Design a protein around this ligand. Structure first.
Ligand SMILES: [Ca+2]
Ligand SMILES: [Ca+2]
Ligand SMILES: [Ca+2]
Ligand SMILES: [Ca+2]
Ligand SMILES: [Ca+2]
Ligand SMILES: [Ca+2]
Ligand SMILES: [Ca+2]
Ligand SMILES: [Ca+2]
Ligand SMILES: [Ca+2]
Lengths: 451, 451, 451
């Protein structure tokens, strides 16, 4: 119909169902439009800001917003939210004494943030020396997603102003405590910035607009999703509905659909690829917090499929995704520098094409040249054993030798094992696993964890 | 009908009786809506802001307000009020001498408070050293309810700037008592901050909107209710009606309804559950002030039920709900570290399901490890004795030996006894009670009180 | 009727007579509404603001103003005037010399003052050491009537900054007189604050709304009335009409009616009770100025009743009411620690119920425990002697012994005497009176005058 309850130029019939913006006017979503590249949009018919961001659903869908905004924020269910941070690249202390910090701001969101004014802490150990705001010398006029200030190839900017003043560790006992080898850290409590909107005269203005107004609203109606690809990180917020309220019309979508919409990962039939790096559930290690783990494990058993990506996305959940550094599937990807032992690729019972036909034991000798010292690593993989009569024990060499037993199930089951490696010029890491009979292995992964 | 006296989009007939919001408009309430999750709202038909908070009745009921405002405040009777406080975490003093403090801001209200600018007094002992207003370094851009700034996982911000000036004790006369073991406390006299409204351009503006405009209004037309769950404290304000004003149409509700509205506690027929922690009258200890206590006691005689949760909420009341630390009912919960002595659960005369059939005396050993030193506790419980012929005396071992006698009544009655414990490495606390004959006991509670 | 000269929604015919607000419309006043709790309002029909305050007659009568304003100001003839003062709690001086003071603002009016910025004087002996205006550290965001900033239980705030700058007596000359025995007083010259109005969009704004615009106006159309209850103080302004102007329609009221309106005192038949404390003319001592006393004295002589509360209120009157500390009426309230001697209650010719049938002399022994040293007191009472043949002399022991003779008249008359008590550990205070024959006594009162 032509019923517009929320007054955002899209009828409630089109928002309940699918719709797409064609020639700036919303039209019904027809399945034939998919091959032309038109994306299907859904939203809430009782709210003009489904995700909580400053821009309405129509402005997002029709691309009527700032053209520096990434195309993942054009989906009404993905919020335009800058994630700014501060990184200390070089610290200079000299003479009490005086401290100089080299900083460079980072952005990892789906929107640019003008007039960046970070607030930072200078903590040594628990005690905070001072809290600093970015003076007019250290404010960035522009900051674009996936870009830094100053731009790449430019030297970082200093930090030597307290209010016209100079940063000082007023207590020389702090200097003596630093003399013991305990460095000074840097953390960002808050960042201040603006956004851009057009006025009645057609001119973008970023003066009165503030991002601090639309932080509490967005952080309360969305679910945090983080992607880690080793070299870069991407943070997204996806709007989720509240369960108790019957007037909440936000669409209910799965976790896999949320990832696909948030990161614009192409889906070639069933698999998910972000930028040529697979992000499928079996091809990456996911990390949750306590509440999200409880929700996932409770909702999993109600579903026969038993897949995390098929679980409905709820409000407040956290989904951290960490792309494994070393991944092998015996089909099209194997980045392990050292070859495996006792591998047979002649099989057809794998997860996608083939599996590993192991008869005996598998041992891998990984050089530590391509390994990060003083880091925690987790080895994971999928195992299949219809026999259910063989016990698998693993021997992994590390700072502390670990020996654990595994009981394979009838179907595919994932195992997670954690070990710590200390010292670059230390003993070589030895990983060994033995099987009583014939076992199937697929998607062996090595994933870095927090240090 | 369609008569709107105060012009807030809700007719008088719907505000006098129950009403609910459906598709951004208000409709008459029907009991069949309870299953679907809809709620029955009531408010005054002569005032457009029943609670006193900036948002009207229609915006509160229909959720036209900020999305960081808890759904507890969507009831037109519960005001959205930010209760922000400040407390020290680390004290830094160095050389006259200089003093530095580390603080973190806590919000326990039901509405976010933007641009937090607290004012604190640095009182050593009686004498006030300084009155500090938060500078540009110590302002919190956002503060969501039940959230702190800096958020969890971040070091507290240092408070050093006095004017850019340095904090200083003028003379060492204060340092004389400081060397003797005196504590410099930090207390918050007031707090400055903003609130969010939607302008005519669809954006949220929080610059001309301040909370210091509505604080006197909210605090004067409301009854204060607080809940202390040991670690988390929630403070609420519930609008009431004037006593001697015929032109005040604020709905009249009891204490139980007020608590259920304020804290959104679910009600399973007769009991009351907040978040899995029962907060019913017989499972918690209530602390009042003088005027509220006298009002309740004078209103209890005219009531046959003699239950606090059935007393009408009057403007100006002060209620504090302290969840007991140790509480057992012998039915579905017993958190006492050590089992009781001489307990018989075979009974059918309990307050809810069953009682305890004690014939003789009961002694309980409470370990010294799980008790807070230098703190005051209270022993609470229920007693039933139809015979009314057995006298009960209690022996309590503490810093000072206490022995009191109790005379049970025909029906259930609550007895409160106060004792003090000092010293972590002191004598173990021993509590002994003796009964002449056979008595019934239920809901044995231990409530922690202020030092 | 249907005529509104001043355009305040209240017809002239209703303003000239009584009127009341019912469902936010002015209606004619009938005497039957008294039992329902409604009040009768009368106001000038040629002025929109009768009392001078920013709130019009309709806003005051219908309660469409700030909800923190006391109901005593809802009367159009009573102005909403905040009386703010600063009290000095402690004085610390240390090193030429630096002075630091702790203060706590007080409010004793019927309106709240936002953004209180008091101005203070530092005077030792005639000379003014400095004049101080509070900076952003000493500004109270909210200050409700009968409340303080900081609130109860919160330590006072330190006043030590003059402009970054520390207060200083520029020489030891101001230090010698402190050793001599002269203390430093602290008095407030003026107070700067804001009031609260609701803007067009429906929000409360308190920025440009200064109280300094309506101090000169209100003080010049009213008559100050102060009530002292020993501990607390209530200052009020009641509108009165100019004597010479024929175009002044401000309603005329008596002093008793003005007091009842201003303090919302409850009148139970003939007695006037404030908060259970009688404020009837017999139970209080009235203090006026010179001009007020002259006008009252010249106005009683044409009045049959011969009572102060029956005198019409005139513009410029200054009335102060003092509630006696020790008041005995020999009926229901004898606060004297020591009982009287030679008293007979067998009488029926008292002022209200009974009198004191004295035949001889009456003596009372009063200890210094309930007496404040260095305080001046006034002894007052009522006497009735139809015979007019007995001379009464009073013997009072004090710092200076006083013996005065009295000649009672035929009817009831009030007698007053002045004496001072010096020294806590001084000679015992002795009060003795002798009656030649039979006399009637009632309502003996003691009050604490200025030191
Ligand atoms: Ca729509
Ligand atoms: Ca919409
Ligand atoms: Ca495969
Ligand atoms: Ca209405
Ligand atoms: Ca209303
Ligand atoms: Ca029970
Ligand atoms: Ca009029
Ligand atoms: Ca008028
Ligand atoms: Ca009498």
């Amino acid at each position: 119909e032509d019923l517009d309850t929320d007054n955002d130029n899209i009828p409630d019939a089109y928002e309940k169902n699918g719709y797409t913006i064609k020639d700036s006017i919303a039209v019904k979503w027809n399945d034939s439009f998919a091959e032309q590249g038109y994306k299907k949009y859904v939203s809430s018919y009782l709210e003009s800001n489904t995700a909580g961001d400053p821009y309405t659903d129509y402005q997002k869908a029709s691309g009527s917003i700032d053209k520096a905004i990434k195309l993942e924020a054009r989906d009404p269910l993905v919020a335009a939210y800058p994630v700014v941070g501060v990184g200390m690249e070089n610290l200079i202390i000299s003479t009490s004494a005086y401290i100089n910090a080299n900083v460079r701001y980072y952005n990892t969101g789906t929107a640019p943030m003008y007039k960046v004014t970070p607030t930072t802490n200078l903590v040594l150990d628990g005690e905070t020396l001072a809290t600093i705001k970015a003076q007019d010398n250290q404010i960035g006029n522009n900051l674009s997603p996936n870009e830094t200030y100053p731009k790449k190839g430019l030297s970082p900017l200093a930090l030597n102003t307290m209010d016209n003043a100079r940063l000082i560790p007023i207590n020389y006992d702090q200097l003596k405590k630093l003399d013991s080898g305990k460095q000074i850290k840097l953390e960002t409590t808050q960042v201040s910035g603006n956004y851009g909107t057009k006025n009645s005269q057609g001119q973008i203005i970023t003066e009165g607009n503030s991002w601090s107004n639309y932080i509490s609203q967005i952080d309360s109606v969305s679910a945090s999703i983080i992607l880690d690809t080793g070299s870069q990180t991407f943070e997204r917020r996806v709007a989720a509905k509240e369960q108790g309220n019957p007037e909440d019309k936000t669409p209910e979508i799965t976790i896999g659909e949320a990832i696909k919409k948030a990161f614009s990962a192409t889906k070639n039939g069933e698999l998910l690829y972000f930028n040529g790096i697979p992000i499928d559930e079996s091809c990456v290690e996911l990390i949750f917090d306590d509440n999200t783990s409880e929700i996932i494990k409770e909702q999993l058993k109600y579903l026969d499929d038993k897949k995390i990506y098929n679980v409905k996305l709820e409000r407040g959940m956290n989904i951290l995704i960490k792309v494994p550094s070393y991944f092998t599937n015996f089909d099209e990807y194997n980045n392990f520098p050292a070859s495996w032992s006792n591998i047979d690729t002649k099989n057809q019972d794998g997860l996608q094409s083939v599996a590993n036909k192991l008869s005996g034991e598998t041992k891998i000798i990984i050089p530590m040249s391509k390994l990060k010292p003083y880091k925690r690593y987790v080895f994971s993989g999928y195992s299949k054993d219809p026999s259910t009569s063989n016990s698998i024990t693993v021997n992994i060499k590390s700072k502390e030798q670990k020996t654990d037993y595994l009981v394979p199930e009838k179907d595919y089951t994932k195992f997670s094992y954690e070990f710590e490696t200390t010292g670059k010029d230390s003993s070589d890491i030895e990983i060994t696993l033995t099987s009583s009979g014939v076992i199937f292995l697929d998607n062996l992964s090595i994933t870095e964890l927090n240090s």
